[PDB]
Structures are given as C-alpha cells and as structure tokens.
Amino acid sequence: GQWDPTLPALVSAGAPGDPLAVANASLQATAQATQTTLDLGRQFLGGLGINLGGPTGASRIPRANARQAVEYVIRRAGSQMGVPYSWGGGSLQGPSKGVDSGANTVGFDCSGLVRYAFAGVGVLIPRFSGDQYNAGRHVPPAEAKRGDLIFYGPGGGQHVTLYLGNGQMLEASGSAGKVTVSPVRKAGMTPFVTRIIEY
Known part of the structure; x- marks a missing residue:
C-alpha cells in the first residue's frame, strides 16, 4: 500500500x-x-x-x-517533544492553534513541526508536506542521513518526519497525539527522502 498504515490516510x-x-x-x-x-x-x-x-x-x-x-x-x-498534535498547528516560533480538527488545540502537525524547526536556521520550507517533499534534493532512502525529511503517502502528502539517524525519526504524530521520536517506518514511505541542508 501507498500510505502509512499507522496514521489516518488523509492528505495533510x-x-x-x-x-x-x-x-x-x-x-x-x-x-x-x-x-x-x-x-x-x-x-x-x-x-x-x-x-x-x-x-x-x-x-x-x-x-x-x-x-x-x-x-x-x-x-x-x-x-x-511532548507538545500536542494539532492539525494545521504551528508558527515559525512555536506551536499554534490549527485548522479544522485542530482549530481549538494549540500544537503542531507533521509539516508544522518540521517547518518550525528549519526556520530556526533561516531556511523556510513550504507549509504543505507534499510541497516540502519537493523542497530539497531527493535521495534514495538507503543513502538517508541525519537531518533528512522522510515522507509518507502519495507524493508525501500524508506525513513528514525528521530523520535522526540511528533508525529513528522525530515526528508530530496523530497516532501518538504529540511530538515524539519513533522508529523509522517502511510501510507507506515515498520513493525518496528529501535533503534540505546539504552536508
């Protein structure tokens, strides 16, 4: 299948x-x-x-x-870590109320978190995960390294996470209900990871 089975199959x-x-x-x-x-x-x-x-x-x-x-x-x-999940949540400076299901919950969603993180070093990535997918250089997952963004769903539209190395990823997870660190999941991954900062 084309989605991460552990999260709702919704376009983010x-x-x-x-x-x-x-x-x-x-x-x-x-x-x-x-x-x-x-x-x-x-x-x-x-x-x-x-x-x-x-x-x-x-x-x-x-x-x-x-x-x-x-x-x-x-x-x-x-x-x-531990900030609640909120659909559409996040500013460039911290958690925020979201939209739709997130409209009254201060937090982050998957793409909100990683956009906040990158903005700290003066790199502005797009708001939508599917756009983030195309905002750097596509690399084969076998060649991923710490700092790359990992995507799930068609065109990376479902979910995005920050690869730590160590077989781990930092994510604002709808299943966890919060920002967490998790093992990297293979099921539903896009063909590439995305390198935002080259090193």
Whole structure:
C-alpha cells in the first residue's frame, strides 16, 4: 500500500485551496514568514559569531556551518517533544492553534513541526508536506542521513518526519497525539527522502 498504515490516510494540512493554504498565500503572510525566517537565521548565525552584511535560503548558510545548522534544527524540533498534535498547528516560533480538527488545540502537525524547526536556521520550507517533499534534493532512502525529511503517502502528502539517524525519526504524530521520536517506518514511505541542508 501507498500510505502509512499507522496514521489516518488523509492528505495533510495546507494542501491546495484548504483554509491554511489560502491564509498563508496572502502577500502579507508570505512577507511576514520570509522576514521572520531571515530574523531567525540571523539569530542562529549570530550565536556562532557571524553577522552577514551588504546585499528555501539553505544557500545563506556558510558551508562551514551546514552541519551545525542541521544539529540546531534537530535540537529545535527536539525542544518540542511532548507538545500536542494539532492539525494545521504551528508558527515559525512555536506551536499554534490549527485548522479544522485542530482549530481549538494549540500544537503542531507533521509539516508544522518540521517547518518550525528549519526556520530556526533561516531556511523556510513550504507549509504543505507534499510541497516540502519537493523542497530539497531527493535521495534514495538507503543513502538517508541525519537531518533528512522522510515522507509518507502519495507524493508525501500524508506525513513528514525528521530523520535522526540511528533508525529513528522525530515526528508530530496523530497516532501518538504529540511530538515524539519513533522508529523509522517502511510501510507507506515515498520513493525518496528529501535533503534540505546539504552536508
């Protein structure tokens, strides 16, 4: 089968025309996300003693600090362990109320969590999991490494997780009801993983 059997076979939040997609496509929202991501990247690079001047954004990270960026993203996602699951939940700075079933629950969904995590190093990935799938470089799962994104469902539309290495993935899981670390699941995986930051 083409879905992860352990999670509902639903296309995830922010898919084309859904409430979350339309909310986010405004010029003002788009600009707010772009600037906030830039602000966070400045914060990350500042903490390393780097302040860029003059005139996804993975290219803004010096090669020297690409590994560190991956570690910071994983740390950031890890900081959210135990936060509740909420469909459509998440801002670039933390959990938020979601949409639909998530409209009154502060939390994260699968794609919300990983977008929050990457934004910490100034990389803005798309809101919808199926878009995230195409936001980096496709790599055969046998060649996956710590930091890659793992996807489930047709076109990665169902679910997305952050591979830790160690046969583990960090995920906002509808079955767990929370942000958790789980063994990597084979059933329902897309053909590729996606590398957002190269190292």
